[PDB]
Design a protein around this ligand. Structure first.
Ligand SMILES: [K+]
Ligand SMILES: [K+]
Ligand SMILES: [Zn+2]
Length: 404
């Protein structure tokens, strides 16, 4: 069965932030408008028996000082008076400012994503669901003691921790426009959680990592890829702007297949940030949600074909209607692949709460008309072999080679 995280309180909290506003409501309501909810298993967000238990859970990754500061940020933003100079300095020291501002619900909002992704992980662990979706989660940039890119708590890292602690190996796949730095860092030293991010990278583009390592020497630059026992276990594919569905699919396809073959993961966690869409305000990549093929749908279908318990998460995407259009198709596709039953989504957006937001055409398709990679493939193939050799993994080097 395919599970999805939702709930009345969950929805309210996920819609309480200034940056993402009511995005989660549009997503879930569009899924509902397409009559998909009865096909899905409702997974309630996790709750804790006490403040201490909650704190224990979140500090499994985050520092106590950082969690304390994030809690204080909420309290301060629920008061009339301005922050003191000392409190400003404190918040700045955790990057709780700039693109990670405070707001009255900042702690509750951030924690909600954690509640949802932990619950999703548990439903996979006890085998209640074969796949679980959490469109309220996917906050890949949050660090141990730093907020980053409107990510305050890293629900992904905490969920993966739960999965690995349930030998267990986890494959993390980050499809967002931006490098999955927080998750990559969290597992930099662990061979058990392999991370793979495909993203745009270019000078001055956030967050700046996931590409060639810039250092003071004249040698050709190279990629960092993990450390200690985690050497070779962090994979990255930076792509130039403008890439379309087909080229993006061909770029990541062989990599995904080779990773599954070599790693043989017990769980897959996929971050499906929707900011690669051609209609995203970034205007960097040109992916679509087309399903006659959308790069996103191509990747998800491939991952699902592995029949490995899978967690599907959200992430970036500041065009709310088109993010909803994409995730609705991802959800329908997941039902179809898992349950082996056909879904017939009307090409026309059905009347519902937010119908008006889908102008002007009101169709399910987004309103859009559509050497380096070979070098990356060779590099990645070499890294995969290196990872396998270091971890004494069994597999056919030629079969994997033939994938590319
Ligand atoms: K990414
Ligand atoms: K790793
Ligand atoms: Zn992003």
């Amino acid at each position: 069965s395919v599970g999805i995280v939702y709930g009345d309180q969950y929805r309210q909290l996920c819609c309480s932030s200034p940056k993402f506003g009511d995005r989660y409501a549009l997503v879930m309501d569009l899924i509902n408008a397409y009559k998909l909810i009865p096909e899905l298993s409702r997974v309630p967000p996790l709750q804790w028996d006490s403040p201490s238990r909650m704190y224990e859970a979140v500090t499994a990754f985050h520092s106590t000082e950082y969690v304390d500061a994030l809690k204080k940020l909420q309290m301060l933003h629920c008061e009339e008076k301005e922050l003191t100079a000392d409190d400003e300095l404190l918040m700045d020291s955790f990057s709780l400012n700039y693109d990670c501002p405070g707001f009255p619900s900042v702690f509750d909002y951030s924690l909600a994503a954690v509640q949802g992704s932990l619950a999703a992980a548990s439903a996979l662990i006890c085998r209640h669901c074969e796949v679980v979706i959490n469109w309220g989660g996917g906050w890949h940039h949050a660090k141990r003691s730093e907020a980053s890119g409107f990510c305050y708590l890293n629900d992904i890292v905490l969920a993966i921790h739960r999965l690995v602690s349930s030998q267990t190996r986890v494959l993390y796949v980050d499809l967002d426009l931006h490098h999955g730095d927080g998750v990559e860092e969290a597992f930099w030293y662990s061979p058990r959680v392999v991370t793979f991010s495909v993203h745009h990278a270019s000078p001055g583009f956030f967050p700046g990592t996931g590409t060639w390592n810039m250092v003071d020497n004249d040698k050709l630059p190279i990629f960092l890829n993990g450390a200690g026992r985690g050497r070779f276990s962090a994979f990255n594919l930076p792509l130039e702007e403008g890439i379309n569905d087909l080229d993006w699919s061909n770029a990541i396809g062989p990599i995904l297949d080779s990773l599954n073959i070599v790693i043989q993961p017990s769980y897959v966690v996929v971050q499906c940030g929707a900011d690669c869409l051609a209609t995203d305000p970034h205007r960097i990549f040109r992916l679509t949600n087309f399903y006659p093929l959308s790069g996103y749908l191509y990747a998800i279908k491939k991952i699902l074909s592995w029949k490995v318990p899978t967690l599907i998460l959200g992430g970036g995407g500041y065009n709310f209607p088109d993010t909803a259009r994409l995730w609705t198709r991802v959800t329908a596709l997941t039902i179809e692949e898992v349950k082996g039953k056909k879904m017939t989504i009307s090409p026309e957006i059905p009347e519902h709460s937010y119908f008006s937001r889908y102008g002007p055409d009101f169709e399910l398709d987004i309103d859009y008309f559509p050497d380096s990679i070979q070098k990356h493939h060779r590099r990645i193939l070499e890294q995969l072999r290196n990872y396998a050799d270091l971890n004494k993994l069994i597999y056919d080097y030629d079969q994997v080679y033939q994938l590319y």
